[PDB]
Design a binder for this molecule. Sequence first.
Ligand code: ID1
Ligand code: CL
Ligand code: CL
Length: 243
Amino acid sequence: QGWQENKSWNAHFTEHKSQGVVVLWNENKQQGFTNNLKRANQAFLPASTFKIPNSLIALDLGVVKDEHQVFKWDGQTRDIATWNRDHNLITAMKYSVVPVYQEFARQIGEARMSKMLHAFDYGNEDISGNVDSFWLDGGIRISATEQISFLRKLYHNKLHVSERSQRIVKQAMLTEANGDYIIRAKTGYSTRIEPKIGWWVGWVELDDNVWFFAMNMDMPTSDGLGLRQAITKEVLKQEKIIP
Ligand SMILES: *C(=O)[C@H]([C@@H](C)O)[C@H]1C[C@@H](SCC/N=C/N)C(C(=O)O)=N1
Ligand SMILES: [Cl-]
Ligand SMILES: [Cl-]
């Protein structure tokens, strides 16, 4: 089997009248768990979770000099208000500012974007579509288990980019931390192509172990976005990963 199936986590999806998959990886024991082995291997558009490889590539090619470089707002008012201001790599990740990352992809270019995604072993490695939207409405597809594989390489500094690039991106992935755990992660909301889904991918660092996770769920409207982190934390608590 490889992966173990734990159907009891479906209770957390059903409790919120939702459908989806959570995948966990225990790094110390090299064991994986999921509520749905089939959906765990189903490949979707990455949407904003593609900000992780896009950040790595932009840094390594010097499109982004460091996490303090300011990317000026282009003056075009967009629907998410946090986008209509200047950003650096830290705040553009936090607020998931698409137009900044679309400019990164334009500067990287089709040829180099394709070779890096092949170097990364990322999903189906297919960038067909527009250079600045293929991860939103083009041909790239990645499963939850494939996100884990990619994230594990990032955690260990094993992707073929500089160690510094990988350290900066993991810094920008910082989402939450207390005296018990650190979460580094990235959210995604795929809306341009059916089915609309939400993503949350990353890992939980403990004193003696790290737990990688990748989840996606059906997201017909934006009012459910909070359930990405809420369902994931319910699974993490049930498995006694976080208190
Ligand atoms: C990437 O996944 C998304 C981009 C492609 O639009 C961004 C946008 C936010 S959600 C939009 C604000 N919702 C309000 N209700 C996002 C996310 O939260 O994952 N990623
Ligand atoms: Cl994006
Ligand atoms: Cl940090």
